[PDB]
Design an enzyme around this catalytic site. Structure first.
Site, PDB file in Angstrom:
ATOM      1  N   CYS A 101       0.784  -0.926   0.387  1.00 19.03           N
ATOM      2  CA  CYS A 101      -0.100  -0.191   0.316  1.00 19.03           C
ATOM      3  C   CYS A 101       0.761   0.999  -0.003  1.00 19.03           C
ATOM      4  CB  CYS A 101      -0.464  -0.051   1.342  1.00 19.03           C
ATOM      5  SG  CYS A 101      -2.251   1.295   1.678  1.00 19.03           S
TER       6      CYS A 101
ATOM      7  N   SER B 196       0.518   3.802   1.790  1.00 20.52           N
ATOM      8  CA  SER B 196       1.239   4.216   2.717  1.00 20.52           C
ATOM      9  C   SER B 196       2.709   3.392   3.679  1.00 20.52           C
ATOM     10  CB  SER B 196       0.252   3.853   3.915  1.00 20.52           C
ATOM     11  OG  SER B 196      -1.380   4.910   4.156  1.00 20.52           O
TER      12      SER B 196
ATOM     13  N   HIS C 261       5.264   5.592   2.578  1.00 16.68           N
ATOM     14  CA  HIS C 261       5.246   7.086   2.958  1.00 16.68           C
ATOM     15  C   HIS C 261       5.991   6.804   4.357  1.00 16.68           C
ATOM     16  CE1 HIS C 261       2.407   8.836   0.636  1.00 16.68           C
ATOM     17  NE2 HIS C 261       1.006   8.565   1.310  1.00 16.68           N
TER      18      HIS C 261
ATOM     19  N   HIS D 153       0.900  -3.767   5.939  1.00 15.73           N
ATOM     20  CA  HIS D 153      -0.438  -3.410   7.414  1.00 15.73           C
ATOM     21  C   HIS D 153      -1.444  -4.304   6.425  1.00 15.73           C
ATOM     22  CE1 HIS D 153      -0.054  -0.430   5.032  1.00 15.73           C
ATOM     23  NE2 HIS D 153      -1.025  -0.667   4.790  1.00 15.73           N
TER      24      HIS D 153
ATOM     25  N   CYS E   8      -7.132  -3.440   3.988  1.00 11.13           N
ATOM     26  CA  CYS E   8      -6.689  -2.122   3.895  1.00 11.13           C
ATOM     27  C   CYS E   8      -7.400  -1.230   2.220  1.00 11.13           C
ATOM     28  CB  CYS E   8      -5.214  -1.639   3.672  1.00 11.13           C
ATOM     29  SG  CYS E   8      -4.946   0.211   3.801  1.00 11.13           S
TER      30      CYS E   8
END
Ligand SMILES: NC(=O)c1ccc[n+]([C@@H]2O[C@H](COP(=O)([O-])OP(=O)(O)OC[C@H]3O[C@@H](n4cnc5c(N)ncnc54)[C@H](O)[C@@H]3O)[C@@H](O)[C@H]2O)c1
Ligand SMILES: NC(=O)c1ccc[n+]([C@@H]2O[C@H](COP(=O)([O-])OP(=O)(O)OC[C@H]3O[C@@H](n4cnc5c(N)ncnc54)[C@H](O)[C@@H]3O)[C@@H](O)[C@H]2O)c1
Ligand SMILES: CCCC[C@@H]1CC[S@](=O)C1
Ligand SMILES: CCCC[C@@H]1CC[S@](=O)C1
Ligand SMILES: [Zn+2]
Ligand SMILES: [Zn+2]
Ligand SMILES: [Zn+2]
Ligand SMILES: [Zn+2]
EC number: 1.1.1.1
Lengths: 374, 374
Positions: free
Chosen positions: A46, A48, A51, A67, A174
């Site tokens: 993902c 994120s 990030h 995650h 997610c």
């Protein structure tokens, strides 16, 4: 066989910001009371997770990121009652303790046991189950799925259908759920409405899926990468627009195409400027705009409050507003019943050891979701 | 007797920013097609009229301000069907054309014929019915009630109960409706909730009234002027706090006293900083914050979008979200049936000619609503 013992396995460790992941040997401790050790089967890449690498999302390093995943329970610590060894499970980056004020509120989902507001990157007890080169490695939002084995708190795991295809339903951990819920639950898209979706990656495509399922009549995809448009249309975008094609600001363009502003707009990118632009492009008196994108750590946006005084509603959500433990299992059940599709998000499949290649694909703009298999 | 003729009367003209109103002779033209000339009976002094004087709210000068009022139809232009000479009426600063996309939407009230977004200060046809010293004087949001006579468009006037007490129901033209609707309609305060109201002037007191009528369990009034606290408690505040009494930021204080953040918060002042503070003090996962106050022209606030990403809902509204022409007559009917009170907002009553004195009372902090009588 491994129950109650330390497991030595491979995990992708991020030792410092802006570096490739390092596939290393780690030791994973056995689950303590109310803890669940999981054998990973599939985990999505993902934005994120990227990030964390770029410094956009701040969380204590070194860390095992990841995650969005699904796996099989290897063992359970004392007192665990919601999952058993052998069960298919999805780890929950937003917990559902079921006892805090948020868990008891009908619309809240941001459980107060989360590790997002004041990140410590540990289990609920303040310690780590991961060791590498003798050093403790942090967890990421109580999940940490870029590892062959992980340990999570019981409130951060949900049991799912025994027959589900984990290389597909990991996206319910997610991406899919966040986008879909953002449209259907947070925004509450209405039948016949006009929607604008900023950002056409996995989450933005799932937002489109949710708007189409809610009966939107027009769904306008917005991306500066036009290679994203074909798939956006495939899952429901009626039109797509690239801000770089125009000499005027995109909110103007969108306000004009929707004859005065859209009913619902979504920021699914993570930029301060597109957050304000998405707000502006929704109809000034009754428009709704939902922020989904994660912005750069600690940075403030600037906006004119007159945008809200006319009547606009501005909101944001984590994980599409879904109470994680209650909804994950139902979303899997709906997927099994073919209520929605997950294949349109999956563009690449790679063995876990090629995680860096999977991140290169995301960063180059070529992929939507790369699923990593263990 | 005056029908079809120019009327010469007194009006309070604002020739330039930051000066006292000038009680002068003006000439009011007869009503054109679909126009209604009203003999004013009572007008309240709202903080927004003072915003016109201070430059906070920008609209073309010179102008006849005033927008919270009630009067009697003196005459109607051709084609008017909704009011007749002798009717009691309340001018609407937000029109209800009934034909635009907002009027037809169930939740919109900011009619597209409004004069707020791009202020011209004229009738709907682009011209003024006011002259003073041979010069054309602007209108203010199609109302202009600081005059013995005014002319409004038919979509900016509502016929009310013939027996209503106009020196009280003028408050339904702005103050009361705005605050009340902000609570009950925009925020949709729920039974048993905790509310925080920033600003305890007439609109803030009305917000308290609506929170109490919605069954809120706790209603915390916030104001730096502690003289405002007694009346706030009278109309429903369970506690009152003054930010100046604390060493720490008020959002902290309020988050602590609500055990994690209030359910509903309201900015009823008009400051950029209190707008962000009000948003912050509402519960991060499911809190709702409503901006009511009017901010200084063209200024942007700064805020962290993480306040919304956790789940908060941020909205604003004009006139408490009420569709003006449909709701004003019902509100008056409710008031006649004693469903709410208006006397608690009225602290002073002065003849129109003492308008400057009425503005001095507001600016000194002494009054809530001063009603001016003609
Ligand atoms: N709120 C939550 O719970 C949650 C859950 C998952 C992801 N997210 C966040 O949602 C965002 C989207 O995630 P993703 O996995 O779909 O990412 P992604 O990187 O696959 O997709 C983002 C898309 O934005 C486009 N884009 C970039 N800059 C743009 C600009 N200036 N204008 C228009 N389009 C632009 C890119 O081309 C890309 O297609 C990220 O910020 C991620 O961190 C939030
Ligand atoms: N949105 C709309 O439709 C609408 C309609 C009417 C009024 N308004 C606006 O609502 C606001 C309130 O109107 P009013 O007539 O009740 O005004 P008011 O001036 O009577 O009341 C404002 C109150 O805020 C308090 N205050 C000032 N600074 C403060 C600070 N820093 N912290 C805490 N409290 C502070 C004052 O002491 C005062 O009691 C104004 O800005 C007005 O223009 C909006
Ligand atoms: C608003 C910040 C949310 C951060 C969460 C990280 C894992 S999921 O992708 C969203
Ligand atoms: C958000 C700006 C609304 C200003 C309007 C002026 C008269 S009423 O007080 C509100
Ligand atoms: Zn909880
Ligand atoms: Zn994610
Ligand atoms: Zn007003
Ligand atoms: Zn209209």
């Amino acid at each position: 066989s491994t129950a109650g013992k330390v497991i030595k396995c491979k995990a992708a460790v991020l030792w410092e910001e802006k570096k490739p992941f390092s596939i290393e040997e780690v030791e994973v401790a056995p689950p303590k009371a109310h803890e669940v050790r999981i054998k990973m089967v599939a985990t999505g890449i993902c934005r994120s997770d990227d990030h964390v690498v770029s410094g956009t999302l701040v969380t204590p390093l070194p860390v095992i990121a990841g995650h969005e995943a699904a796996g099989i329970v290897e063992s359970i610590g004392e007192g665990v009652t919601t999952v058993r060894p052998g069960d298919k499970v999805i780890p929950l980056f937003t917990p559902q303790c079921g006892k805090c004020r948020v868990c008891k509120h009908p619309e809240g989902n941001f459980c107060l046991k989360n590790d997002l507001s004041m990140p410590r990157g540990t289990m609920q007890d303040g310690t780590s189950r991961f060791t590498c080169r003798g050093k403790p490695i942090h967890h990421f939002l109580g999940t940490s799925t870029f590892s062959q084995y992980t340990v999570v708190d019981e409130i951060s795991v949900a049991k799912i259908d025994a027959a589900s295809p984990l290389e597909k339903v990991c996206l319910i951990g997610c991406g899919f759920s966040t986008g879909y819920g953002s449209a259907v639950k947070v925004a509450k898209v209405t039948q016949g409405s006009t929607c604008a979706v900023f950002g056409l990656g996995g989450v933005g495509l799932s937002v489109i899926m949710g708007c189409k399922a809610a009966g939107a009549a027009r769904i306008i995809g917005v991306d500066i990468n036009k290679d994203k448009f074909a798939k956006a249309k495939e899952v429901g975008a009626t039109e797509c627009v690239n801000p770089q094609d125009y000499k005027k600001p995109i909110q103007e363009v969108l306000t004009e195409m929707s004859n005065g502003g859209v009913d619902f707009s979504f920021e699914v990118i993570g930029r301060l400027d597109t957050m304000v632009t998405a707000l502006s492009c929704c109809q000034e008196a009754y428009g709704v705009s939902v922020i989904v994108g994660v912005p750069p750590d600690s940075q403030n946006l600037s906006m004119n409050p007159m945008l809200l005084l006319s009547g606009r509603t501005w909101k944001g959500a984590i994980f599409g507003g879904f109470k994680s433990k209650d909804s994950v299992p139902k979303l899997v059940a709906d997927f099994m019943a073919k209520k929605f599709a997950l294949d349109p998000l999956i563009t690449h499949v790679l063995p876990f050891e090629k995680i860096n290649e999977g991140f290169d694909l995301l960063r180059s703009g070529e992929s939507i979701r790369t699923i990593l298999t263990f």
